[PDB]
Amino acid sequence: QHQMFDPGVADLLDTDILTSPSKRKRKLK
Amino acid sequence: QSLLTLDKIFNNATSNRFSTMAFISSLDILTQLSKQTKSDYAIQYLIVGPDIMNKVFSSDDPLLLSAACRYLVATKNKLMQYPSTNKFVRMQNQYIMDLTNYLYRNKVLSSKSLFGVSPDFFKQILENLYIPTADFKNAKFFTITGIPALSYICIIILRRLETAENTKIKFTSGIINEETFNNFFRVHHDEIGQHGWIKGVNNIHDLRVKILMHLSNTANPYRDIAAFLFTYLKSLSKYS
């Protein structure tokens, strides 16, 4: 996976929605 | 001038023009002030200072870049009047060195920093940054032909150069760089030697040079970026 966030930044910021769109699509519908 | 250069009034993304014309006007006043240096001045508040110049360099509006060098040639007219080992002379020596390297010399990665930013970013920033010809990820950004606003300018420059030259061969790519340059010659190489494309060029540096040669005359509003930096790059001075 490319650095959508820096590896020193992805350490804290949640990456779940990028691993699966379900967590994000849950809010959309 | 501190106010105009704050990001929220002049953001390189949300760049309202009014900030730019206001500043280059204020910057312009210093160019007249430098040319009227018959009246003496304190060395403080003659050089606009690094916090302003790394800011304008970080932006890319070509008129603003034209103003910056146009200010520095005016600053140059005052430069020799001070000893070299003055800080105010030392900071402005860093501008021209970095500005020359960023625009023409192309050896930026070997520099200690680009506008105060270490090159180790630049390789890392180009990660998650998709480029068609990743074979040359880095050298694109270290030239006016790839510097974004100036890149599209260089497309316009080469179109007139090709038209004035009446080339039957044409630069296949839009944006100009080393690999766009070399790709369409290797297929035309056996007849590029005779005629068909610009005869004042045989390598990418020459195309960058000839891009500046049009900029070396009164026609362009952006002529000053080439003219100012001829004075430092010896080869570019000779071509001028």
- As a three-state string, the secondary structure of chain A is CCCCCCHHHHCCCCCHHHHCCHHHHHHHC
Structure's resolution in angstroms: 3.4
Contact A23, A16 (CB under 8 A): yes
Spatial separation of the C-alpha atoms in residues B240 and B213, rounded to whole Å: 7
Tokens of A10: 């992805």
Provide the 10 A C-beta neighbour count for residue B68: 24
The alpha-carbon gap from A26 to the nearest alpha carbon of chain B, in Å, equals 27
Spatial separation of the C-alpha atoms in residues B166 and B20, rounded to whole Å: 37
Q: What are phi and psi of B108, to 5 degrees?
A: -85, -40
Radius of gyration of chain A from Cα atoms? 11
Which of A1, A3, A4, A5 is the mutation pick for testing B, counting most B CBs within 10 A?
A: A3
Which chain B residues touch A4 with a CB distance below 8 Å?
128
Contact residues for B94 (Cβ-Cβ < 8 A; gap 6+) = B50
Read off the amino acid at residue A24.
R
Contact B143, B177 (CB under 8 A): yes
Ranges of H-type helices in B44-192: 50-58, 62-79, 87-100, 119-125, 148-165, 178-186, 189-192
Task: Please answer yes or no on whether A4 and B128 come within 8 Å at the CB atom.
Answer: yes
Q: Is the dihedral of CA B16, B22, B28, B33 positive or negative?
A: negative
Spatial separation of the C-alpha atoms in residues B55 and B51, rounded to whole Å: 6
Q: What are phi and psi of B10, to 5 degrees?
A: -135, 90
The alpha-carbon gap from A18 to the nearest alpha carbon of chain B, in Å, equals 14
Which chain B residues touch A6 with a CB distance below 8 Å?
124
Which chain A residues touch B123 with a CB distance below 8 Å?
none
Nearest by Cα to B50 from B113, B111, B110 = B113
In terms of CA atoms, which chain A residue is nearest residue B130? A2
CA angle (B196 as vertex; B193, B201 as ends), nearest 5: 60
Size of interface A-B (CB pairs under 8 A): 7
H-run or E-run covering B216: none
Spatial separation of the C-alpha atoms in residues B205 and B202, rounded to whole Å: 8
The alpha-carbon gap from A23 to the nearest alpha carbon of chain B, in Å, equals 23
Contact B148, B60 (CB under 8 A): yes
Nearest by Cα to B76 from B34, B114, B121 = B34
DSSP reduced 3-state for B114 = strand
Q: Which residue has the tokens 């690999």?
A: B179
Contact B225, B66 (CB under 8 A): yes
Largest separation between any pair of C-alpha atoms in chain A: 32
Spatial separation of the C-alpha atoms in residues B156 and B162, rounded to whole Å: 10
Which chain A residues touch B128 with a CB distance below 8 Å?
2-4
Contact residues for A10 (Cβ-Cβ < 8 A; gap 6+) = A3, A4
Spatial separation of the C-alpha atoms in residues B70 and B80, rounded to whole Å: 17
The alpha-carbon gap from B109 to the nearest alpha carbon of chain A, in Å, equals 20
Selected residues 1-29 of chain A with any CB under 8 Å from a CB in chain B: 2-4, 6
In sequence order, what DSSP letters do the residues of B187-206 get, joined into one string?
Answer: TTHHHHTTSSS-TT-SSHHH
Spatial separation of the C-alpha atoms in residues A14 and B80, rounded to whole Å: 56
The alpha-carbon gap from B127 to the nearest alpha carbon of chain A, in Å, equals 7
Spatial separation of the C-alpha atoms in residues A17 and B19, rounded to whole Å: 39
Spatial separation of the C-alpha atoms in residues B148 and B13, rounded to whole Å: 12
Q: Which residue has the tokens 């870049």?
A: B65
Contact B36, B77 (CB under 8 A): no
Which chain A residues touch B134 with a CB distance below 8 Å?
none
Which chain A residues touch B127 with a CB distance below 8 Å?
2-3
In terms of CA atoms, which chain A residue is nearest residue B126? A3
Report DSSP state, residue B59: S
Method: cryo-EM
Read off the amino acid at residue B176.
I
User: Residues B166-205, buried b or exposed e (16+ Cβ, 10 A)?
Assistant: ebebebebeebbbebbeebbeeeeeebeeeebbeebeebb
